[PDB]
Symmetry: C5
Subunit: 400 residues, 5 copies
């Protein structure tokens, strides 16, 4: 329209985009900075980066971009692109994006009274410290730090407004707790001018249903299946195969899991302690199986059992476990021949009885160690999962 064309022609006249738009130079310019979180697109524990889709919200009063609506009846707002009117250079301080500024420079709306608006979208990559000590039951506080890059306190009086999450779309992995902000004033070694900033802390809680179903449950099942070695009879040579192939499967699983975790050394992750406990339990099960097979394939001629181990393993554990404890010259010379055969058979029977007693001792050791291992693994897993704080509320919110 003619009025809009005239207004645009007269508005840009004698206008310097570099100049700070204030009537009095000494007075600082008030800028209201806010944020509009839309989606936590991705968080990278390994890379310690947080990818978010947010809309920055900036607003300030421009002294030069004013006009009377009476002379321009139809024109109420005007929009200027990048590089034609003054804009605050508000950057994300802790940015992990290859280009330090990830905003998409859009137009700037202008009141009929000089008030300006600026909502540049963009996907921000911020380097936030991520705790995996309580993985997967961890809550994260990733900070977004915004502030003017080259204007100080006396120039650009930055002000905070509450972050808006009305348009936030829920993420399938992270539950948002809140996004509070805090306005802080910080000095710098360059200059004697404070540089105010606005810091937004994105507190988000990880939803642990997928991790509990795909990481914790399979390890519980495989560890419990490793205890089956203590039910296999030793006569079938499959105990070591069972134990060691279970160990190999656990090795593959733990390798795949560790493929996705940060190489941080601040503390031992909860899942790392859990996997260490499972590995130790399986290894000690294999060691006990080796001991049991030593006690089972014990040659009777090797030597008599020690009295102490004999009495304890055949009395105390049996009482505890309620196990059942098993149990003319030609004529004379033929007689002595049959005597040799019969005595050989009797000696064979005695050796067989000794070996059977050794086998029973192996079985008793096996059963007692099965009970001990089952109790220990249950107690250890329960304790490890109890140790994580907010674990009960994570369970209540996800599973229940």
């Amino acid at each position: 329209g003619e009025f809009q064309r005239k207004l645009y022609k007269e508005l840009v006249k004698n206008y310097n985009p570099l100049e700070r738009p204030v009537a009095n130079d000494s007075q600082p310019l008030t800028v209201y900075f806010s944020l509009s979180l839309l989606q936590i697109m991705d968080v990278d524990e390994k890379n310690q980066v947080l990818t978010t889709n947010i809309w920055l919200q900036m607003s300030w009063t421009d002294h030069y971009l004013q006009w009377n609506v009476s002379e321009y009846p139809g024109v109420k707002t005007v929009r200027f692109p990048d590089g034609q009117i003054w804009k605050p250079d508000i950057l994300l301080y802790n940015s992990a994006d290859e280009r330090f500024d990830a905003t998409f420079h859009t137009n700037v709306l202008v009141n009929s009274s000089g008030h300006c608006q600026y909502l540049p979208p963009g996907i921000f990559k911020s380097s936030c410290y991520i705790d995996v000590r309580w993985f997967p039951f961890d809550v994260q506080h990733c900070k977004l730090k915004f502030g003017s890059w080259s204007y100080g306190g006396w120039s650009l009086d930055l002000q905070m407004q509450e972050a808006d999450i009305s348009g936030y779309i829920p993420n399938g992995e992270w539950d948002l707790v809140g996004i509070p902000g805090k306005r802080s004033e910080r000095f710098y070694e360059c200059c004697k001018e404070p540089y105010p900033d606005v810091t937004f802390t994105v507190t988000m809680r990880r939803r642990t249903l997928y991790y509990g179903l795909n990481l914790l449950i399979p390890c519980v099942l495989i560890s419990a299946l490793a205890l089956l070695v203590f039910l296999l009879p030793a006569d079938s040579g499959e105990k070591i195969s069972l134990g060691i192939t279970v160990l190999l499967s656990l090795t593959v699983f733990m390798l795949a899991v560790a493929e996705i975790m940060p190489a941080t050394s601040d503390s031992v992750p909860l899942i790392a302690q859990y996997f260490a406990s499972t590995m130790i339990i399986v290894g000690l099960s294999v060691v006990v199986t080796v001991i049991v097979l030593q006690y089972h394939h014990h040659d009777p001629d090797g030597g008599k059992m020690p009295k102490w181990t004999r009495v304890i393993l055949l009395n105390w554990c049996a009482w505890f476990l309620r196990m059942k404890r098993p149990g003319d010259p030609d004529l004379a010379k033929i007689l002595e021949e049959v005597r040799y055969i019969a005595n050989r058979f009797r000696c064979q029977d005695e050796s067989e009885a000794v070996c059977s007693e050794w086998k029973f001792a192996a079985c008793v050791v096996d059963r007692l160690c099965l009970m001990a291992f089952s109790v220990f693994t249950i107690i250890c897993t329960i304790g490890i999962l109890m140790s994580a704080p907010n674990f009960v509320e994570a369970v209540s919110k996800d599973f229940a």
Copy 2:
């Protein structure tokens, strides 16, 4: 030509690219926005992003870009590049691209009567929520939201035109159901001006031939092969090897499959429930194999078989399964010695008969558990695959 050069020289004179091209400022400018889907290049279930190749279509009437063809005999249309004539700043709201605007700014055609056209191509990355609950038999509704960024209802009267899929090239993985649109008016906390938008919902159905052939069928085959442990005779100490190696192979398969799935916690994926069922079946088969081997290698001196289990496992299951149930002083002193040898042989035969009865009990348990496991596996797989809606039509469209 001379006429075209004169027209270009005169048309740009006193033209402001910022001004909205309307004759009456109060009246809003009508913009007809459409879309031309060409190809669904990629969808990322893990990243919850949808990559599409589309041509945006905008059209509006420009009051200033008008001329009489009589004075320019050969010139019917003119073309302006980016930044020289007014263009709507129609952006994809839910964009997951590193740069928020993925369009390639092309030329802009103009009528001889002022009507304008604008078809900027580009590959758009939009963050759409992806449901894996019914994976791989899921239908996806990924939304594309377009609307002016700085112009409200009273400024840019955005309108919807039906999406064009004439040039759409079929994708090898996803079957397009449709791309309907909906024009909605939404308020914002910034301003008291409604901002109309156009939302296109891309309804896509996944073609399940590849997934059924490469994920489901191998699991059915391996789970069925795990049941072979219940046909191996216990004498060959290989049952545990069979079952455990099958479990390890399934572990590798499920790990590789889960490598491609999003870490969402809204619901348990169908294939996740299926894998859980297969893992449980294999583990229970291994447990039953351990019990069977306990029954097989039962020492006759350990104790008499309990009356209840004896009667049930030797009468009821045998009747059910129709199994066959098997079955001077020198002379006298030599006599008593040969009596000893024969009595030893008779006791050995009695112990052998008891052990054989134990072995038959183990075989009966093994056979009945084979039948139970086969029936349970078939029923569970059929039910899980039935639970997915549109499974029947997916099968009919893909396989048949």
Copy 3:
């Protein structure tokens, strides 16, 4: 020089880069579009993208960029950068590149008679449909679609010149069959003006030496090694171990291979059918092994063999395979005692003979199934590899 400086000063005078350089506006401008393929740097079967290094070739006549060499003795050509003289906006329609235009805008040569040249290089990512039905013996026809984006038939009369492959450097994976093209005229729903285009079809044949050596040969070898179970005597407890560890190795191999193939559902890949055949063969090998072990470890007291299976497996298969078929009162009291011992030995010998006959039946079953499985594997692999068209010429060109 002075002449060149004067020519450049006078040439740009009253020159509009937007204007189409024609003397008569009504007549269209003839543009000769060609292409110079140099290297097929990459083709992504999984992503359905083709990455090529090509030089576009454009040529047209400028009415305004003309001068007389007499007044400029030294100057024969002039060069203009991007954005200073008119250039056709010829884009790759089916572009899968993040930026829709991948050309590198270079200088533009000009005749002394107005003729123009333009050879912008660039690496083009085009989305071409890729058939893996005959993989790895497949030939691919990936299309490149070029045409003016905003000029119609009456404005830019696009013409075609044959593609140049003189400078093409051979690829180590793909053998170029040819790059023919076709110039087509297509209408659009926007406008009543046809838009001519030039489509180049890149027909390339995959060289199958690497794939045959690294995928097909190892699977033949592993499948053949799986048949060794039918030579292992059943006395050594290793048959299921062999079969199932071969199955696990094939599982790893097929997983690694399937990691590289697209998730298309148009048809079952040839290598997919081949792997399915190998998996079925190994699975049935394990099943037959379980059957043979059932036959081998058959208790003699379990029951007499069925007459039909006895006669067939001990006569017909033996004849076929030419197998060798194996085979005072004290005196009376001692008499009856030794009679008992010898009768027990005779019964033991009878049971041993029955069990040995069962073992021979198992051996005969094993041998006949070995012959059947070897024949079936050879026939199936030969048929599957024969089914692929141009397989014989692929072999002749690669191996021979």
Copy 4:
């Protein structure tokens, strides 16, 4: 304000951004270059690149950007964007980034006396040589080299200021030792003008907790578990299964670990020597197990054991290990028949005794080799981890 607008209008007048801002052309311009490290975001051992988030700090005196505050009462500092005032072209020489300059060009503050400030942020990818010889106990010295690209010693007198690490945020993997620098003057083959530069050496020590917990400890555990083959009795045919499955698990572990190390050939990494030692230990354990099984399954009819090995293995090793060393015509016809049976039994017993002696020799060899292997593996691991310098202080700082 009016004063700010007048100052900006008058300051840019007759200003040339290309000109070096010095009053006397002959005198060089002093530029103070510093650095502000904030975070070592990522280091890539495989790619030999270091990714850091740093703020360059440059400052110089501009002769033309001076004004009297008396005439501009409110204006104390002014800010210019990129391309409008002279800036030093200080580039990172050893840059491994796709674009050689990774800085984000921000504004430049200016004193009321001409002093200028410039703190452009950016994420810098520098190619630093990385030593993996002492991995994971290595300390890295990655260099950052900065200097003017086109200004020599007589033009831009580059000067140094100490690097600032007040704002440094600790990294979860690398402990910063310090960031000292050195200012060096270097000639070039192009020109006879020295080019001063500022080189900052980023000395960082790797925190070892995660690597020791996830790489070293599992290898210790698996190697120790491989020694259990020397406790399993040879009667249970599971020794080779144990050894070879442990070897396969170690193969998987070493493959996964070697996936993350560079293909560096200056020296053998410490973890590489460690894995080589573990592989040798496991392989030699398998070889010794094969020898032990040869000794155990020695047919008595094969031949008498050599006198030398007999005496040593049954006297010296027994003394060392304190092992218990185990241990009418009708009447005549029946007579000689029973004589035959008893003589057969006696010969059988003699052969059994010889085989038992062979088995005891195998057991003694097995035990002595167990002791030798345990001692050797402990000594080798201890020595390898001792060989790394600063290992003790790394352990003290991380674990303790």
Copy 5:
């Protein structure tokens, strides 16, 4: 300075950046092109791309950028940025970078006599053909082709200068042999003007320490460990387990290695032939193990050992290997019963002797095949490693 400002103001006056800076238009402009290699940052065998960090060096005489130092006492050189003075459009022809030009356009120094310098840095991605036939002992000749894109021979007389490698930093993987260049003149189909170019061949030799320590040595070790199956006594059912687990480990290793090689079909890589030999050796070892177990578990009643195999395997191989070759009515009725028992024992002894002879034949076959396999493996590995040229000098340079 005032002199510098005046010089810059006067120099740009009547200066056209498009014009070629020559006094006489007819004579070509001489441009001296060189290169300064700094680091071979990365080479991609799979992608056939070479990533280098180089500084292009260009120099030419500008007729217009001349001044007398007498009138400008302090000004000796001036610097112009991109787009303000003429620069050769020298591009890397065989560029594989997404943007065809990877240079970073820096400033451009100028003499006081008109001579000009230009050293743009940048990381260049070039598509160079990579031979993996002799991998890992291969030497690579990757070409970099530079030349003016738009200027021909009569316009821009491109000239060569020797490449500079004084600042080259050694790479941890590739040993640089040299970077010779060659200036060639090549015609094009577009134009009748030759286009001179400068081609630099980067000859680099791969350092084989890491590859020989992580790829070759483990394969030698695993292949040698596969031969242990020929020392295991057949009585312990672990031969097939050993051989097949070794084969599975080799499968995993070869899959991981083949993950990193190009899918080229020009020729079979040396490491591929090596892996084929190892796989064949292991598979044939498994086949021979199956044959040995057939010979060992040969029932005596199947049939007499054939005369030919009997004589050869019990005489010739025994002589070769020097193996030890092992070895009233009541009375009469009781008599005949004991005769039956004794005859049964004698027949059992004869069958045992026949079985022992079969076992000895199996042992003889096993030992001879062990010797054959060891010799064949050593010979094949030595020959394959010898076949690669420059292998001896690669070993001398890396290991020694």
